[PDB]
Amino acid sequence: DLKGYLDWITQAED
Amino acid sequence: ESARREVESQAQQQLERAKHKPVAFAVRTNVSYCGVLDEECPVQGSGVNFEAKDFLHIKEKYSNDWWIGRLVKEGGDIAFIPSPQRLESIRLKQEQKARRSGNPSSLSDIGNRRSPPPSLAKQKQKQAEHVPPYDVVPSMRPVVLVGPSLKGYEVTDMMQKALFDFLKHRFDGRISITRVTADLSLAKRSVLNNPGKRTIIERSSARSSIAEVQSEIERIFELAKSLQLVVLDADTINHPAQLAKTSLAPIIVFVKVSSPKVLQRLIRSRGKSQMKHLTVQMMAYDKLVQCPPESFDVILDENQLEDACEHLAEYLEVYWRATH
Numbered sequence: 001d002l003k004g005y006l007d008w009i010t011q012a013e014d
Numbered sequence: 015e016s017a018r019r020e021v022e023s024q025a026q027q028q029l030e031r032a033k034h035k036p037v038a039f040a041v042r043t044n045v046s047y048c049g050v051l052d053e054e055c056p057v058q059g060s061g062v063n064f065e066a067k068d069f070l071h072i073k074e075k076y077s078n079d080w081w082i083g084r085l086v087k088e089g090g091d092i093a094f095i096p097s098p099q100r101l102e103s104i105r106l107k108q109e110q111k112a113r114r115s116g117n118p119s120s121l122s123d124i125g126n127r128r129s130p131p132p133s134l135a136k137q138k139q140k141q142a143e144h145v146p147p148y149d150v151v152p153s154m155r156p157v158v159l160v161g162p163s164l165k166g167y168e169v170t171d172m173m174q175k176a177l178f179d180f181l182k183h184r185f186d187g188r189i190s191i192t193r194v195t196a197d198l199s200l201a202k203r204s205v206l207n208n209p210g211k212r213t214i215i216e217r218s219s220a221r222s223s224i225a226e227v228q229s230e231i232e233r234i235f236e237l238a239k240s241l242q243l244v245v246l247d248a249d250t251i252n253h254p255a256q257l258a259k260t261s262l263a264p265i266i267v268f269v270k271v272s273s274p275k276v277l278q279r280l281i282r283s284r285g286k287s288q289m290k291h292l293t294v295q296m297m298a299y300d301k302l303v304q305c306p307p308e309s310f311d312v313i314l315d316e317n318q319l320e321d322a323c324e325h326l327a328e329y330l331e332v333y334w335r336a337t338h
Contacts, residue, residue, distance in 0.1 A: 001272055001273075001276050001317050002276060002279065004317040004318045004319070005271075005276055005280065005317055006280075006283060007319065008173065008176065008317075008318075008319055008322075009172070009173065009280060009283070009284075011176070011319075012172040012173060012175055012176035013168075013171075013172035013175065
């Protein structure tokens, strides 16, 4: 889950 | 009788003339009724089989007892929906077929207490609440993203910003994205006849922000009539029930996490800034996940970027085609 959850949390703003 | 056939033909002939005309307005029905069983419909057999919490689109005007409307469902045909007064007439019809409707019980008491119908036995009484059967809701339901934590912070703003850009790119040239700063959860209709009519009264509610609340609501109404899809980026929404009783009732889109363990490590990857407010972010997810899922319009349980995006894409596309 953290694989697809940490990738969504980064590219959105940064 | 030829008059009934003539009025059937004249009303029917007008039906296809308005088939390709812009939608006038829209309301919401919170009661279950069928427009085909009624014998007072101008056209018999072309009624609407609607249920509680449905949507309709009025386009023209016919009379004070009937209206022309189109169902929000895909493939919606021409149908007749009873007027607010007409629904009241059939509302009294539903509970008048019983043995008694007022105070005088028929418990083996006939011939002694006639009990002529008083004022309390009619619809003019019971004015404590007087919930209107038809509520003026926007023609198109606005789409709002909620969760998984407090709005206006780093966590919630960016995980919703991506979906705004993803929807904007695919719906470019046909969608409008607007962010509202004023509070929207206070969209009430039956508080007073005109709370804070003027800004120079210098009353309790004249100098407050309540006046700014209503001004945005009519803009939402006018933006709804534009026929273009509109989503709201309101930061004043945290619970679906807070913005459920209001007339707008936006589309509540829920983003959920499989376990709090994922959430706890998420802020850990952010930094030292969000750990201080991490205590209230954990509460926000908990107080939102305990709400029953059926209240929320849709759910987003997928974790990937793509499967989370296109899942809502067809839901909005099927709604877009269903309206027209």
